[PDB]
Design a protein around this ligand. Structure first.
Ligand SMILES: CCCCCCCC/C=C\CCCCCCCC(=O)O[C@@H](COC(=O)CCCCCCCCCCCCCCC)COP(=O)([O-])OCC[N+](C)(C)C
Ligand SMILES: CCCCCCCCCCCCCCCCCCCC(=O)O[C@H](COC(=O)CCCCCCCCCCCCCC)COP(=O)(O)OCCN
Ligand SMILES: CCCCCCCC/C=C\CCCCCCCC(=O)OC[C@H](CO)OC(=O)CCCCCCCCCCCCCCC
Ligand SMILES: CC(C)CCC[C@@H](C)[C@H]1CC[C@H]2[C@@H]3CC=C4C[C@@H](OC(=O)CCC(=O)O)CC[C@]4(C)[C@H]3CC[C@]12C
Ligand SMILES: [Ca+2]
Ligand SMILES: [Zn+2]
Lengths: 675, 40
């Protein structure tokens, strides 16, 4: 039971001011005139009177989009400050032209008319403003330590951040870009890249910068979709500041630009150089052509080596043929690797240092070619780009393992000369180490074949999606490792008092890899291995029993093991499944664009003339006119895009408002004529 | 700190053409008629 009052009271204006505001709002070309005369003579009305909701007479007239009252008030020298911004926001060209013809605010004090027009993205008002030689400030580098930036960040961080965001939002306007830039596509590429990089430095305002970068990418794509001819498309794609613009787009991660249908058709035409009407043929004949071209890989290569200008020697220069030949060569290498571990070719397993066999002699040139190709690619093409592939890491590991295997084999051959039973060799015998490294490198080289899946229309998107989920798998791995370490520490602390020697165990075997598992929690390493193997159910339940009858200790150990099993197998795995499902739901939307970007990147690596020969055979020893053409095509594209966007801007609300205003104007004119 | 200009400028029409387009858009059965007579 407490009354309600007004705490922050507003100082009301007099009846004269209220009547003046009412007349201004209603619209009376004569009553407002006589009110202004009275204000001039007797000062009964304040010319600068304000509505309690901060709405002066000029603002009321602007919101009423009637220009006669505004012109009269301008002639009467009313306070005109901060009215051009209201006109711009209302998007009224006539009023904007009128004010351009010469406390409390709804706009921050850093906003300029040109910036506000750019925020609105109105081409007609932006052009009108830019016609009067306006400028826009440009911000400092993302990581800048200059005194002016440091002082600004030290006095008003909120103001600094808001000003930077406003400037970038103005600069990212498609209409401003089209009006004021000479290379709109390149400008959009660079601006999108800069905004994407800035979003992670200003982590608080991340979504705004993300949306600005998406806006720039959409503008570039939509500008590309306005091409009407193959000649125009080639002029756009081949412009050098052979497909220089496409390479720049790939560098700047313009996936929607690259995956556009007109670009994909050009790329496919370049890809199928020697097979006109490839999509006309049946899948059976295409498959048979693939097999026959694959089997002739040793030829077409010797021909290219002995006669590049010959008809046969020019066949391997086509991208699809080159890809098929490289694939066939890699498959042959893998087949020899398979042949290495067979009974047919490898015998006499009793020699300490064995000379290389025929299969190893055949294998060596492939390894040399792989290493030479990796080094040559890394030298020619950029060192910093070589590491942003995530497959070159596998290549490096595989080649390092092969080099270590060769070195260990040579060392063993030099050091050892004779025979000895394998059962009495030491643990660290060079032959044993070389065999282990060879097996690991075989696994890696066989797993490398995944990267060829992106060339297929059915397996490529699936491979991209799996590669996208791998990161979140890596995210869960951390929590799992922490839980595993905690429980391993506890179990080892409990059980380390009951260690036994291998002598007293059956068969003199110690650990969990024996037929009767024992000493599962005697050391930290063994405890970690046991807790890892219990995830798949390969650890038996009698490993929690000690030889003595310590029932309390055995029960505590069993309860520890059961709690670990519950936490690991009932909770963490199901949470992993749930978040896998959530990730795949979002990933499945953009699978096509990512797959086409990946396939374009894969195709573009076979276009150049470097590294034509497969690894087995690769170790044997005017501008102005182009600028005018680009400018003409850009003019046409910008005109078409602007016209299309203007015709799209026709909306029901705008049309209804325009018709209502026009009908009101005509009715007023007819009433005045009658009167 | 670099000014903004117009790169791909459009060749504007004269005041007569602008007035003719304005009359056509607004709607004047007689003003457009006399403008066409003047053009003739
Ligand atoms: C991941 C990126 C890197 C990939 C691998 C690059 C390097 C490859 C090869 C490195 C070869 C090292 C030298 C081997 C002989 C020298 C020697 O005395 O070895 C000692 C140790 O030897 C070992 O314990 C072997 C370890 C080999 C690497 C095992 C992991 C491979 C992962 C592969 C990826 C899955 C012998 O012991 P001791 O000194 O007598 O006591
Ligand atoms: C005593 C030791 C005994 C060891 C015994 C085991 C030996 C073998 C170990 C194997 C380890 C795992 C190997 C996995 C190979 C396949 C990788 C996944 C393939 C896939 O679909 O995803 C790709 C990623 O692969 C990649 O990026 C490839 C990653 C290669 C890592 C190599 C590490 C060495 C996608 O392709 P993408 O790269 O485009 O993905 C997006 C990048 N933004
Ligand atoms: C980080 C992750 C946070 C998750 C937090 C939740 C953890 C759940 C802990 C549950 C403890 C279960 C321990 C059971 C146990 O050790 O028994 C072994 C021991 C064997 O000696 O058994 C017992 O001591 C009691 C036997 C009855 C157990 C009843 C089972 C209830 C558990 C329901 C789990 C559903 C499956
Ligand atoms: C599961 C077992 C049988 C794997 C055996 C290894 C190889 C025999 C396989 C593994 C990956 C395969 C490759 C996966 C995808 C392609 C792309 C494919 O290209 C197309 O499909 C082009 C037409 C299109 O775009 O659909 C040509 C065969 C090739 C190189 C495959 C050739 C045979 C490879 C090397
Ligand atoms: Ca490589
Ligand atoms: Zn600075």
């Amino acid at each position: 039971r407490i009354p309600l009052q007004i705490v922050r009271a507003e100082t009301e204006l007099s009846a004269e001011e209220k009547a003046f505001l009412n007349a201004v709002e209603k619209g009376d070309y004569a009553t407002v005139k006589q009110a202004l005369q009275e204000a001039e003579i007797y000062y009964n009305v304040n010319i600068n009177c304000m509505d309690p909701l901060g709405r002066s007479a000029l603002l009321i007239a602007i919101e009423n989009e009637n220009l006669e009252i505004m012109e009269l008030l301008l002639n009467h020298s009313v306070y005109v400050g901060d009215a051009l911004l209201y006109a711009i926001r209302k998007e009224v060209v006539g009023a904007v032209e009128l004010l351009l013809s010469y406390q409390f605010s709804e706009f921050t004090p850093d906003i300029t008319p040109i910036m506000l027009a750019a925020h609105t993205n109105n081409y007609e008002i932006i052009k009108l403003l830019v016609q009067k030689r306006v400028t826009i400030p440009r911000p400092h580098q993302i990581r800048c330590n200059c005194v002016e930036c440091v002082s600004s960040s030290e006095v008003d961080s909120l103001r600094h951040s808001r000003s930077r965001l406003n400037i970038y939002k103005a600069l990212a306007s498609p209409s401003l870009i089209a009006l004021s830039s000479e290379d709109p596509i390149l400008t959009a590429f660079r601006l999108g890249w800069e905004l994407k990089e800035l979003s992670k430095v200003e982590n608080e305002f991340k979504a705004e910068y993300e949306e600005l970068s998406q806006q720039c990418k959409l503008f570039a794509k939509d500008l590309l979709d306005q091409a009407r001819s193959s000649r125009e498309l080639e002029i756009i794609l081949n412009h050098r500041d052979d497909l220089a613009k496409l390479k720049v787009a790939i560098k700047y991660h313009q996936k929607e630009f690259v995956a556009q249908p007109n670009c994909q058709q050009l790329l496919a035409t370049l890809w199928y150089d020697g097979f006109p009407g490839w999509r006309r043929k049946h899948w059976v004949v295409k498959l048979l052509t693939c097999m026959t071209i694959g089997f002739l890989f040793p030829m077409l290569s010797i021909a290219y080596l002995i006669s590049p200008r010959s008809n046969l020697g020019l066949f391997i220069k086509k991208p699809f043929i080159k890809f098929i030949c490289h694939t066939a060569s890699y498959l042959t290498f893998l087949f020899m690797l398979l042949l290495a571990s067979q009974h047919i070719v490898r015998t006499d397993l009793h020699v300490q240092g064995p000379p290389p066999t025929v299969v190893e002699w055949m294998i060596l040139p492939w390894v040399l070619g792989f290493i030479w190709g990796e080094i040559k690619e890394m030298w020619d093409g950029g060192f910093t780009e070589y590491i942003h592939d995530w497959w070159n890491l596998m290549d490096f590991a595989m080649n390092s393992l092969y080099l270590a295997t060769i070195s260990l084999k040579i060392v063993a051959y030099v050091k050892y000369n004779g025979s000895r039973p394998r059962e009495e060799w030491e643990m660290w015998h060079p032959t044993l180490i070389a065999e282990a490294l060879f097996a690991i490198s075989n696994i890696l080289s066989s797993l490398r074949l995944i990267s060829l899946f992106t060339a297929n229309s059915h397996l490529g998107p699936l491979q991209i999606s799996l590669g996208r989920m791998l990161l979140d798998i890596l995210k869960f791995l951390f929590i799992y490792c922490l839980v595993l370490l905690a429980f391993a520490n506890g179990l080892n602390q409990l059980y380390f008092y009951y260690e036994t020697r291998a002598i007293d165990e059956p068969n003199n075997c110690k650990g969990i890899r024996c037929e009767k598992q024992n000493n599962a929690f005697s050391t930290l390493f063994e405890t970690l291995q046991s807790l890892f193997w219990s995830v798949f159910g390969l650890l038996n339940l009698y490993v929690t029993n000690v030889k003595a009858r310590h029932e309390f200790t055995e029960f505590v150990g069993a309860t520890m093991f059961g709690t670990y099993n519950v936490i690991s197998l009932v909770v963490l795995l199901n949470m992993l499944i749930a978040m896998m499902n959530n990730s795949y739901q979002l990933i499945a939307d953009h699978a096509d664009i990512e797959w086409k970007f990946a396939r374009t990147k894969l195709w573009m690596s076979y276009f150049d003339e470097g590294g034509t020969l497969p690894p087995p055979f690769n170790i044997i020893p005017d501008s102005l006119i182009q600028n005018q053409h680009y400018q003409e095509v850009i003019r046409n594209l910008v005109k078409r895009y602007v016209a299309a966007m203007i015709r799209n801007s026709k909306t029901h609300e705008g049309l209804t408002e325009e018709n209502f205003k026009e009908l009101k104007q005509d009715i007023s004119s007819f009433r005045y004529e009658v009167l």
